[PDB]
Amino acid sequence: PQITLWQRPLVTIKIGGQLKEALLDTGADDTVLEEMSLPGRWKPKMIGGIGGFIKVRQYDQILIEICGHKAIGTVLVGPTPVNIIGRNLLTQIGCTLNF
Amino acid sequence: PQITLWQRPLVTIKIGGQLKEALLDTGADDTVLEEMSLPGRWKPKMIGGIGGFIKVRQYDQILIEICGHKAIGTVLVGPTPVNIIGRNLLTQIGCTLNF
Numbered sequence: 110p111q112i113t114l115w116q117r118p119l120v121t122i123k124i125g126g127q128l129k130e131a132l133l134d135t136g137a138d139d140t141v142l143e144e145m146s147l148p149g150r151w152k153p154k155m156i157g158g159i160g161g162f163i164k165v166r167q168y169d170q171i172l173i174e175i176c177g178h179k180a181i182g183t184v185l186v187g188p189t190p191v192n193i194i195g196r197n198l199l200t201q202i203g204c205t206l207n208f
Numbered sequence: 209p210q211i212t213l214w215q216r217p218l219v220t221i222k223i224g225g226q227l228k229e230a231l232l233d234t235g236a237d238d239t240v241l242e243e244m245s246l247p248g249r250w251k252p253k254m255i256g257g258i259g260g261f262i263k264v265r266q267y268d269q270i271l272i273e274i275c276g277h278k279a280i281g282t283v284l285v286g287p288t289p290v291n292i293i294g295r296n297l298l299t300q301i302g303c304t305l306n307f
């Protein structure tokens with residue numbers, strides 16, 4: 110699909126059996142979701158953005174579906190104010206910026 | 209042009225006759241630039257990102273060129289980790305997300 114940017118590019122995603130709303134963020138290296146449980150081992154990580162850093166749990170090899178497109182990748186879980194789909198998964202669904 | 213996301217979508221912008229590097233950020237409502245000098249009066253604004261909020265100076269109707277595309281809009285100046293081009297200006301240059 111072609112997503113305009115007049116409004117925030119919010120999409121529904123499916124992960125760990127849950128449907129969630131997430132922001133497609135080309136300015137995010139990683140995908141960060143609000144607190145939730147995920148399977149497998151995880152390791153701590155510190156990620157930053159506007160306002161500073163937050164500590165998150167890093168899970169690898171997580172399956173996610175965004176607009177019918179299935180992807181596999183690392184997913185960070187922590188006190189993020191919004192669910193964010195970063196470049197690590199945007200590439201997998203073939204998402205590009207165009208103008 | 210079409211910009212893939214295997215790497216950060218960093219581009220060259222021109223503001224105040226000077227070239228700077230900036231990140232095309234679809235997850236950002238606004239455009240935030242690192243400390244620099246801009247003309248006119250500014251208004252106060254508090255913006256929130258991944259690790260909290262920061263105070264910035266808001267300048268309106270500022271001329272800024274992005275990848276050769278001219279835009280004139282609101283530019284926020286403050287302690288941002290990197291120069292961010294948000295939706296307010298991405299829309300002016302006709303940018304969309306596609307997959």
Ligand SMILES: CC(C)(C)OC(=O)N[C@@H](Cc1ccccc1)[C@@H](O)CN[C@@H](Cc1ccccc1)C(=O)N[C@@H](CCC(N)=O)C(=O)N[C@@H](Cc1ccccc1)C(N)=O
Binds near residue numbers: 136140190236
């Ligand atoms: C700019 C503005 C108007 C304040 O909006 C946001 O910050 N919006 C953010 C989402 C949001 C919206 C509303 C409320 C809360 C949160 C996000 O879209 C901004 N995109 C980038 C902006 C950016 C880019 C580079 C540097 C600083 C800031 C981002 O946060 N990116 C983070 C996302 C988290 C992540 N882990 O991917 C990122 O790429 N961080 C990297 C790079 C990094 C390292 C160290 C410091 C800063 C940034 C990282 N590995 O931590």
